[PDB]
Amino acid sequence: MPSIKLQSSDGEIFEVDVEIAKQSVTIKTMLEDLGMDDEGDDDPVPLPNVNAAILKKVIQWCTHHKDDPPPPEDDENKEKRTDDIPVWDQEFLKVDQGTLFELILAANYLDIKGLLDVTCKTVANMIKGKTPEEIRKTFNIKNDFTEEEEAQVRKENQWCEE
């Protein structure tokens, strides 16, 4: 089986089937324009913006989606919802907020469309339909607004208010 080496910032050398790792757009472009064209001597491809555990999780996710059908290339009026997440995708993402956010960062770095889409969907589902106090309690953001800024934003957005 054709293979590739993905190296973490920690130093762990993971081995991924190249047909699996080609789901990530960045690795696909690298091994379609530079890597497999030259046939590099199986040197580890370093990925210094991710850590070991997050790389292991993206590898697990991508292996679980190695035979995934191509995504529907539709936007705007297609109205991408937040409930069509697969049940295994729902169960796999059940981690704390730090791991989920590092997974989103890894998904944006490797440009894995499916993983980024489902992680953004779960994060949106953690926000959709909650009061601002509920959002700031579920997450951890201090209110940087002053009284003047709070009054300004209230005056700007006092229209959805019923």
């Binding site: 989103i104 980024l116 994060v123 953001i141 800024e149 934003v153």
Partner: protein
Amino acid sequence: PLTLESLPTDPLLLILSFLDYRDLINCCYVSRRLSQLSSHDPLWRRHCKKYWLISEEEKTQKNQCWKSLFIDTYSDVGRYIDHYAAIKKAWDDLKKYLEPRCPRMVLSLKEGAREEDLDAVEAQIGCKLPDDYRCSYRIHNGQKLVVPGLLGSMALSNHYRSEDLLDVDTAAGGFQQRQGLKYCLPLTFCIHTGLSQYIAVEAAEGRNKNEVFYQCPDQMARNPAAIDMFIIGATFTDWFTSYVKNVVSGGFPIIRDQIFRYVHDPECVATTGDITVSVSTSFLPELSSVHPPHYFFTYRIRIEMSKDALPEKACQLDSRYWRITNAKGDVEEVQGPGVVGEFPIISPGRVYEYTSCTTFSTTSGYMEGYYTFHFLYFKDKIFNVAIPRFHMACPTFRVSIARLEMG
């Protein structure tokens, strides 16, 4: 140590793109970064091209940014936000299909009715109009009293029906609160006949709220409150969207530069030889009744010969054998020479369409039969043309609660 605010601009924009409009406004109060990123103009593009159906061309004409378009629209038709996206989709479709078709009806349409007029209507009638009905009359106040109307028409040999959508003020003037038809509001008038496709602004007298029905009086009962109903659609949105789907799907044929309420089923085709027979059915609530059951129907037959056929196969109608069948299985037959007192010619290029009336005394019913053409050049030869077995159908009636309680 890394939180949602610490995420980069692009994943945060992807996260906020999946949120709904109330959540995007709700994120404006959360933090300064989320407030800045919620006012991103593409973010109010999934929320404006679907909630108000405002396309790119409308934006370029109004030269406004997307969030400004959304706030300007929410300041106008905002409280109908969960209905507008449907109703305008009908209203901008009926006004589109009528643009190459009958142009006098859309030119008869008034502009939008402001909220002051609808509030005056609500104060006058003493009840609350349905929100979707308010949105639909906000997009268009209907039309002034001009024949033909917007909600279809029906033309017999003698009884001509044409119903035009009623404005807010005339609906308030024609609002009814009497016993029987209590808290019922008209959506159309006929002028010629007096049809009033009422809607129920309040659930009373055996009607669930926001239902659309015809007015069919009880001829047998002498109670003035005994009025029977002929329910058309579930709600106002269902009624209007079903009508618009029928109009733009070709289900309602365009005849005499009007919209006709001819429910034509594509199954009801019995083309024999080069003669193509096509039948369309319709219901008329003025000539129909419930007690006693009259259940009037009309039907138009589209007989024609294809131009591919040679002219030497020329034929002429001389008979109409009809197998009227009700829900009790009774069969009645007519054999009168010529359809509707006429002997038409079926020729290559000729299309004969005539209206006729039937009186199925039960709620169901169907017909079949033969024309038995006599050939033109060969005066002895006769062709056979079979009418398809088209199945009549009156809408779901509802006996008045005055009659239901009575006994």
